[PDB]
Design an enzyme around this catalytic site. Structure first.
Site, mmCIF file in Angstrom:
data_model
loop_
_atom_site.group_PDB
_atom_site.id
_atom_site.type_symbol
_atom_site.label_atom_id
_atom_site.label_comp_id
_atom_site.label_asym_id
_atom_site.label_seq_id
_atom_site.Cartn_x
_atom_site.Cartn_y
_atom_site.Cartn_z
ATOM 1 N N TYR A 170 -2.799 -7.884 39.331
ATOM 2 C CA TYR A 170 -3.654 -6.798 39.793
ATOM 3 C C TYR A 170 -3.245 -6.386 41.195
ATOM 4 C CZ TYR A 170 -6.363 -7.703 35.691
ATOM 5 O OH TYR A 170 -6.615 -7.833 34.346
ATOM 6 N N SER A 171 -3.041 -5.087 41.390
ATOM 7 C CA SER A 171 -2.766 -4.547 42.720
ATOM 8 C C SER A 171 -3.897 -4.927 43.672
ATOM 9 C CB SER A 171 -2.638 -3.013 42.667
ATOM 10 O OG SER A 171 -1.708 -2.592 41.684
ATOM 11 N N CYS A 198 1.708 5.221 41.370
ATOM 12 C CA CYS A 198 1.020 4.095 40.751
ATOM 13 C C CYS A 198 -0.017 4.557 39.750
ATOM 14 C CB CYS A 198 0.362 3.218 41.813
ATOM 15 S SG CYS A 198 -0.086 1.587 41.222
ATOM 16 N N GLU A 255 5.158 1.816 40.739
ATOM 17 C CA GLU A 255 4.518 0.708 40.044
ATOM 18 C C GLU A 255 3.604 1.240 38.948
ATOM 19 O OE1 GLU A 255 2.855 -2.866 42.193
ATOM 20 O OE2 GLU A 255 1.017 -1.978 41.380
ATOM 21 N N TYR A 297 2.131 0.717 34.755
ATOM 22 C CA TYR A 297 1.764 -0.327 33.808
ATOM 23 C C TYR A 297 0.865 0.254 32.730
ATOM 24 C CZ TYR A 297 -2.142 -0.156 37.121
ATOM 25 O OH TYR A 297 -3.163 0.300 37.924
#
Ligand code: FAD
Length: 295
Positions: free
Chosen positions: A71-72, A253, A293, A295
Protein backbone atom coordinates in the site's frame (compact mmCIF):
# COMPACT_ATOMS: atom_id res chain seq x y z
CA UNK A 1 20.01 6.94 2.57
CA UNK A 2 16.43 6.26 1.53
CA UNK A 3 15.18 3.76 4.15
CA UNK A 4 14.12 0.43 2.64
CA UNK A 5 13.24 -2.94 4.20
CA UNK A 6 13.71 -1.92 7.83
CA UNK A 7 11.16 -4.68 8.51
CA UNK A 8 10.70 -7.88 6.48
CA UNK A 9 7.94 -10.54 6.15
CA UNK A 10 9.73 -13.02 8.46
CA UNK A 11 9.78 -10.49 11.32
CA UNK A 12 7.27 -7.67 10.71
CA UNK A 13 6.65 -4.58 12.83
CA UNK A 14 3.48 -4.95 14.92
CA UNK A 15 1.73 -1.60 14.83
CA UNK A 16 -1.54 -0.50 16.39
CA UNK A 17 -4.46 1.13 14.59
CA UNK A 18 -5.11 4.61 15.95
CA UNK A 19 -8.01 5.59 13.70
CA UNK A 20 -10.00 4.41 10.69
CA UNK A 21 -12.05 7.14 9.03
CA UNK A 22 -14.25 7.04 5.90
CA UNK A 23 -13.22 9.20 2.94
CA UNK A 24 -16.15 8.53 0.60
CA UNK A 25 -19.05 10.83 1.44
CA UNK A 26 -22.75 9.98 1.11
CA UNK A 27 -23.84 9.56 -2.50
CA UNK A 28 -20.47 8.17 -3.54
CA UNK A 29 -19.41 4.76 -4.85
CA UNK A 30 -17.61 2.20 -2.74
CA UNK A 31 -15.57 2.34 0.45
CA UNK A 32 -12.24 4.11 0.92
CA UNK A 33 -10.80 4.47 4.41
CA UNK A 34 -8.01 6.60 5.86
CA UNK A 35 -6.22 4.44 8.44
CA UNK A 36 -3.55 5.75 10.80
CA UNK A 37 -1.08 3.49 12.65
CA UNK A 38 1.06 3.98 15.72
CA UNK A 39 4.75 3.39 15.07
CA UNK A 40 6.09 3.90 18.59
CA UNK A 41 8.16 0.97 19.76
CA UNK A 42 9.76 0.24 16.41
CA UNK A 43 12.21 2.00 14.13
CA UNK A 44 10.06 2.20 11.00
CA UNK A 45 11.18 5.28 9.10
CA UNK A 46 9.93 6.23 5.65
CA UNK A 47 9.76 9.12 3.19
CA UNK A 48 7.23 10.46 0.67
CA UNK A 49 6.44 8.20 -2.26
CA UNK A 50 7.18 4.84 -0.61
CA UNK A 51 4.88 1.88 0.17
CA UNK A 52 4.55 -0.56 3.06
CA UNK A 53 3.33 -4.15 3.19
CA UNK A 54 0.41 -5.36 5.31
CA UNK A 55 0.14 -9.04 6.18
CA UNK A 56 -3.57 -9.96 6.55
CA UNK A 57 -4.68 -12.75 8.91
CA UNK A 58 -5.97 -16.08 7.67
CA UNK A 59 -5.22 -18.70 5.06
CA UNK A 60 -6.08 -18.73 1.37
CA UNK A 61 -8.47 -21.29 -0.08
CA UNK A 62 -5.60 -23.76 0.03
CA UNK A 63 -4.56 -23.73 3.69
CA UNK A 64 -1.51 -21.56 3.00
CA UNK A 65 -0.90 -18.34 4.99
CA UNK A 66 -1.91 -15.09 3.29
CA UNK A 67 0.87 -13.06 1.68
CA UNK A 68 1.44 -9.33 2.08
CA UNK A 69 -0.22 -6.67 -0.07
CA UNK A 70 1.57 -3.37 -0.75
CA UNK A 71 0.00 0.00 0.00
CA UNK A 72 1.28 3.45 -0.95
CA UNK A 73 2.06 5.52 2.15
CA UNK A 74 -0.51 8.32 2.42
CA UNK A 75 1.25 10.44 5.05
CA UNK A 76 4.49 12.44 4.87
CA UNK A 77 7.56 11.23 6.77
CA UNK A 78 6.29 13.07 9.87
CA UNK A 79 2.82 11.51 9.99
CA UNK A 80 -0.52 13.33 9.75
CA UNK A 81 0.06 14.92 13.18
CA UNK A 82 3.62 15.96 12.27
CA UNK A 83 4.99 14.15 15.32
CA UNK A 84 7.10 11.44 13.62
CA UNK A 85 5.09 8.73 15.41
CA UNK A 86 2.52 7.42 12.93
CA UNK A 87 1.83 6.33 9.34
CA UNK A 88 -1.37 6.46 7.27
CA UNK A 89 -2.81 4.48 4.38
CA UNK A 90 -5.62 5.15 1.91
CA UNK A 91 -7.39 1.83 1.28
CA UNK A 92 -10.30 1.08 -1.05
CA UNK A 93 -12.30 -2.05 -0.35
CA UNK A 94 -12.02 -4.37 -3.33
CA UNK A 95 -15.18 -6.25 -4.21
CA UNK A 96 -16.48 -7.50 -7.52
CA UNK A 97 -19.19 -9.28 -9.46
CA UNK A 98 -21.64 -11.97 -8.42
CA UNK A 99 -20.98 -14.12 -11.53
CA UNK A 100 -17.56 -15.09 -10.19
CA UNK A 101 -17.36 -18.44 -8.33
CA UNK A 102 -19.23 -18.18 -5.00
CA UNK A 103 -20.78 -14.94 -6.28
CA UNK A 104 -19.65 -11.60 -4.81
CA UNK A 105 -16.06 -11.54 -3.85
CA UNK A 106 -14.39 -9.34 -1.22
CA UNK A 107 -10.68 -8.67 -1.31
CA UNK A 108 -8.97 -10.24 1.69
CA UNK A 109 -6.54 -7.54 2.76
CA UNK A 110 -8.60 -4.51 1.70
CA UNK A 111 -11.72 -5.78 3.48
CA UNK A 112 -9.61 -6.56 6.55
CA UNK A 113 -8.15 -3.06 6.56
CA UNK A 114 -11.29 -1.06 5.79
CA UNK A 115 -13.15 -2.70 8.70
CA UNK A 116 -10.33 -2.82 11.25
CA UNK A 117 -10.90 -1.31 14.73
CA UNK A 118 -8.78 1.17 16.72
CA UNK A 119 -6.51 -0.74 19.09
CA UNK A 120 -5.98 -3.71 16.77
CA UNK A 121 -2.45 -4.86 15.96
CA UNK A 122 -1.26 -5.08 12.36
CA UNK A 123 1.79 -6.69 10.74
CA UNK A 124 3.69 -4.05 8.76
CA UNK A 125 6.70 -4.55 6.46
CA UNK A 126 8.89 -2.12 4.52
CA UNK A 127 9.16 0.61 3.56
CA UNK A 128 9.70 -0.21 -0.10
CA UNK A 129 10.07 1.80 -3.29
CA UNK A 130 12.54 4.21 -4.85
CA UNK A 131 10.51 4.98 -7.98
CA UNK A 132 8.10 7.62 -6.65
CA UNK A 133 10.41 9.85 -4.63
CA UNK A 134 10.11 13.65 -4.61
CA UNK A 135 13.15 15.75 -5.60
CA UNK A 136 14.40 17.92 -2.74
CA UNK A 137 14.59 20.81 -5.22
CA UNK A 138 12.09 23.53 -4.13
CA UNK A 139 11.95 24.99 -7.65
CA UNK A 140 10.69 21.78 -9.23
CA UNK A 141 7.50 21.56 -11.22
CA UNK A 142 5.45 18.55 -10.18
CA UNK A 143 2.73 17.14 -12.41
CA UNK A 144 0.55 14.60 -10.58
CA UNK A 145 -1.81 12.34 -12.48
CA UNK A 146 -3.93 10.24 -10.13
CA UNK A 147 -7.02 8.04 -10.10
CA UNK A 148 -8.79 6.74 -7.02
CA UNK A 149 -6.38 5.52 -4.36
CA UNK A 150 -3.52 6.73 -6.54
CA UNK A 151 -4.04 10.01 -4.65
CA UNK A 152 -2.02 8.49 -1.77
CA UNK A 153 1.53 9.42 -2.92
CA UNK A 154 0.25 12.76 -4.22
CA UNK A 155 -1.08 13.60 -0.76
CA UNK A 156 2.38 13.05 0.78
CA UNK A 157 3.98 15.40 -1.77
CA UNK A 158 1.33 18.11 -1.45
CA UNK A 159 1.28 18.02 2.35
CA UNK A 160 5.08 18.33 2.45
CA UNK A 161 4.81 21.26 0.03
CA UNK A 162 1.87 23.24 1.39
CA UNK A 163 0.90 22.40 4.99
CA UNK A 164 1.90 25.05 7.53
CA UNK A 165 3.10 22.47 10.08
CA UNK A 166 5.15 20.68 7.45
CA UNK A 167 6.79 23.91 6.30
CA UNK A 168 7.62 24.67 9.92
CA UNK A 169 9.15 21.21 10.32
CA UNK A 170 11.04 21.07 7.01
CA UNK A 171 13.14 24.28 7.01
CA UNK A 172 15.21 22.86 4.14
CA UNK A 173 12.23 22.51 1.80
CA UNK A 174 10.14 25.60 1.15
CA UNK A 175 8.33 24.79 -2.08
CA UNK A 176 8.14 27.61 -4.60
CA UNK A 177 7.69 25.65 -7.82
CA UNK A 178 4.43 24.81 -9.57
CA UNK A 179 2.36 21.67 -9.06
CA UNK A 180 -0.75 20.50 -10.85
CA UNK A 181 -2.97 17.61 -9.76
CA UNK A 182 -5.30 16.03 -12.28
CA UNK A 183 -7.58 13.71 -10.31
CA UNK A 184 -10.07 11.22 -11.74
CA UNK A 185 -12.95 9.89 -9.61
CA UNK A 186 -16.55 8.76 -10.36
CA UNK A 187 -18.42 11.35 -8.26
CA UNK A 188 -17.84 14.48 -6.18
CA UNK A 189 -18.48 12.46 -2.98
CA UNK A 190 -15.59 10.28 -4.17
CA UNK A 191 -13.03 13.09 -4.25
CA UNK A 192 -10.72 11.83 -1.52
CA UNK A 193 -9.36 14.71 0.62
CA UNK A 194 -11.46 17.22 -1.36
CA UNK A 195 -11.65 19.82 1.40
CA UNK A 196 -7.91 19.81 2.07
CA UNK A 197 -6.94 19.83 -1.61
CA UNK A 198 -9.17 22.85 -2.22
CA UNK A 199 -7.88 24.64 0.87
CA UNK A 200 -4.36 24.33 -0.54
CA UNK A 201 -5.46 25.56 -3.94
CA UNK A 202 -6.93 28.63 -2.25
CA UNK A 203 -3.82 29.41 -0.17
CA UNK A 204 -1.45 28.84 -3.09
CA UNK A 205 -3.19 29.81 -6.35
CA UNK A 206 0.13 30.43 -8.08
CA UNK A 207 1.78 27.22 -6.88
CA UNK A 208 -1.02 24.67 -7.12
CA UNK A 209 -3.61 23.91 -9.76
CA UNK A 210 -6.32 21.31 -9.24
CA UNK A 211 -8.25 19.66 -12.06
CA UNK A 212 -10.91 16.98 -11.59
CA UNK A 213 -12.25 14.43 -14.06
CA UNK A 214 -15.58 13.25 -12.61
CA UNK A 215 -17.09 10.61 -14.87
CA UNK A 216 -20.66 10.46 -13.52
CA UNK A 217 -21.02 14.25 -13.57
CA UNK A 218 -18.99 15.41 -16.58
CA UNK A 219 -18.94 14.53 -20.28
CA UNK A 220 -15.92 14.64 -22.60
CA UNK A 221 -16.21 16.22 -26.08
CA UNK A 222 -17.29 12.88 -27.65
CA UNK A 223 -20.29 12.61 -25.33
CA UNK A 224 -18.71 9.95 -23.15
CA UNK A 225 -17.92 10.12 -19.44
CA UNK A 226 -15.07 12.39 -18.34
CA UNK A 227 -11.95 10.38 -17.50
CA UNK A 228 -8.45 11.52 -16.61
CA UNK A 229 -7.14 10.86 -20.14
CA UNK A 230 -9.80 13.26 -21.44
CA UNK A 231 -8.52 16.00 -19.12
CA UNK A 232 -4.94 15.26 -20.17
CA UNK A 233 -5.91 15.48 -23.86
CA UNK A 234 -7.60 18.79 -23.05
CA UNK A 235 -4.40 20.25 -21.61
CA UNK A 236 -1.90 18.20 -23.63
CA UNK A 237 -0.10 21.22 -25.12
CA UNK A 238 0.50 22.99 -21.81
CA UNK A 239 1.36 19.71 -20.08
CA UNK A 240 3.92 19.08 -22.85
CA UNK A 241 5.37 22.55 -22.43
CA UNK A 242 5.84 22.06 -18.69
CA UNK A 243 7.45 18.67 -19.37
CA UNK A 244 10.17 20.32 -21.52
CA UNK A 245 11.46 22.17 -18.44
CA UNK A 246 14.51 20.38 -17.02
CA UNK A 247 13.06 20.74 -13.51
CA UNK A 248 9.69 19.11 -14.19
CA UNK A 249 8.80 15.75 -12.64
CA UNK A 250 5.69 13.80 -13.58
CA UNK A 251 4.01 11.26 -11.29
CA UNK A 252 1.37 8.76 -12.39
CA UNK A 253 -0.50 6.59 -9.88
CA UNK A 254 -3.72 4.65 -9.85
CA UNK A 255 -5.22 1.58 -11.45
CA UNK A 256 -3.47 0.06 -14.45
CA UNK A 257 -4.52 1.10 -17.95
CA UNK A 258 -4.46 4.88 -17.42
CA UNK A 259 -0.96 5.23 -18.87
CA UNK A 260 -1.98 4.52 -22.48
CA UNK A 261 -4.47 7.34 -22.97
CA UNK A 262 -1.96 9.71 -21.39
CA UNK A 263 0.80 8.77 -23.83
CA UNK A 264 -1.49 9.15 -26.85
CA UNK A 265 -2.37 12.70 -25.77
CA UNK A 266 1.28 13.67 -25.24
CA UNK A 267 2.37 11.98 -28.47
CA UNK A 268 0.17 14.34 -30.50
CA UNK A 269 1.43 17.42 -28.62
CA UNK A 270 5.11 16.45 -28.91
CA UNK A 271 4.69 15.54 -32.60
CA UNK A 272 3.83 19.16 -33.41
CA UNK A 273 7.46 20.01 -32.68
CA UNK A 274 9.14 17.07 -34.39
CA UNK A 275 9.66 15.09 -31.16
CA UNK A 276 8.77 11.41 -30.75
CA UNK A 277 7.14 11.14 -27.33
CA UNK A 278 7.97 7.48 -26.68
CA UNK A 279 11.65 8.23 -27.31
CA UNK A 280 11.61 11.44 -25.26
CA UNK A 281 9.86 9.57 -22.42
CA UNK A 282 12.55 6.87 -22.37
CA UNK A 283 15.00 9.69 -21.76
CA UNK A 284 12.78 11.10 -18.97
CA UNK A 285 12.70 7.67 -17.32
CA UNK A 286 16.49 7.36 -17.49
CA UNK A 287 16.79 10.84 -15.96
CA UNK A 288 14.48 9.84 -13.12
CA UNK A 289 11.87 12.46 -14.01
CA UNK A 290 9.10 10.07 -15.04
CA UNK A 291 7.53 8.21 -12.13
CA UNK A 292 4.89 5.54 -12.62
CA UNK A 293 3.12 3.27 -10.14
CA UNK A 294 0.00 1.51 -11.36
CA UNK A 295 -1.79 -1.57 -10.07
C1 FAD B 1 2.82 -0.46 -5.14
C2 FAD B 1 1.35 -0.69 -4.85
C3 FAD B 1 0.68 0.22 -4.17
C4 FAD B 1 -0.68 0.07 -3.87
N1 FAD B 1 -1.30 1.03 -3.20
C5 FAD B 1 -2.57 0.91 -2.86
C6 FAD B 1 -3.27 2.01 -2.11
O1 FAD B 1 -2.74 3.05 -1.73
N2 FAD B 1 -4.61 1.79 -1.81
C7 FAD B 1 -5.30 0.65 -2.19
O2 FAD B 1 -6.50 0.53 -1.92
N3 FAD B 1 -4.62 -0.30 -2.91
C8 FAD B 1 -3.32 -0.23 -3.23
N4 FAD B 1 -2.73 -1.21 -3.98
C9 FAD B 1 -3.43 -2.65 -4.18
C10 FAD B 1 -3.29 -3.37 -2.93
O3 FAD B 1 -1.99 -3.94 -3.47
C11 FAD B 1 -4.08 -4.68 -2.96
O4 FAD B 1 -3.83 -5.35 -4.22
C12 FAD B 1 -5.60 -4.42 -3.28
O5 FAD B 1 -5.97 -3.72 -2.08
C13 FAD B 1 -6.50 -5.64 -3.33
O6 FAD B 1 -6.07 -6.61 -2.30
P1 FAD B 1 -7.06 -7.55 -1.50
O7 FAD B 1 -6.23 -8.10 -0.60
O8 FAD B 1 -8.17 -6.65 -1.05
O9 FAD B 1 -7.42 -8.73 -2.55
P2 FAD B 1 -7.48 -10.01 -3.31
O10 FAD B 1 -8.39 -10.60 -2.32
O11 FAD B 1 -6.10 -10.48 -3.42
O12 FAD B 1 -7.95 -9.72 -4.74
C14 FAD B 1 -7.09 -9.41 -5.81
C15 FAD B 1 -7.41 -10.48 -6.82
O13 FAD B 1 -8.82 -10.61 -7.17
C16 FAD B 1 -8.93 -10.40 -8.59
N5 FAD B 1 -9.72 -9.16 -9.03
C17 FAD B 1 -9.57 -7.84 -8.64
N6 FAD B 1 -10.43 -7.00 -9.20
C18 FAD B 1 -11.23 -7.79 -10.04
C19 FAD B 1 -12.35 -7.50 -10.94
N7 FAD B 1 -12.96 -6.30 -11.12
N8 FAD B 1 -12.86 -8.53 -11.65
C20 FAD B 1 -12.34 -9.77 -11.45
N9 FAD B 1 -11.34 -10.18 -10.63
C21 FAD B 1 -10.81 -9.11 -9.94
C22 FAD B 1 -7.49 -10.70 -9.14
O14 FAD B 1 -7.27 -12.12 -9.35
C23 FAD B 1 -6.59 -10.11 -8.04
O15 FAD B 1 -5.38 -10.84 -7.99
C24 FAD B 1 -1.38 -1.09 -4.28
C25 FAD B 1 -0.64 -2.06 -5.00
C26 FAD B 1 0.67 -1.90 -5.26
C27 FAD B 1 1.35 -3.01 -6.04
Amino acid sequence: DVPVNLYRPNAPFIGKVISNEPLVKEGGIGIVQHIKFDLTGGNLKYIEGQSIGIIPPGVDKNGKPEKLRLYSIASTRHGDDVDDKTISLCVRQLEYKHPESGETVYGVCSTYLTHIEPGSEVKITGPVGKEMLLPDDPEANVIMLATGTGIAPMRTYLWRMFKDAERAANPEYQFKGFSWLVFGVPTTPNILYKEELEEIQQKYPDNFRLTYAISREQKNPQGGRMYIQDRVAEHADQLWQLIKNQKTHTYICGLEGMEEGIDAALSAAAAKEGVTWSDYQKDLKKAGRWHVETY
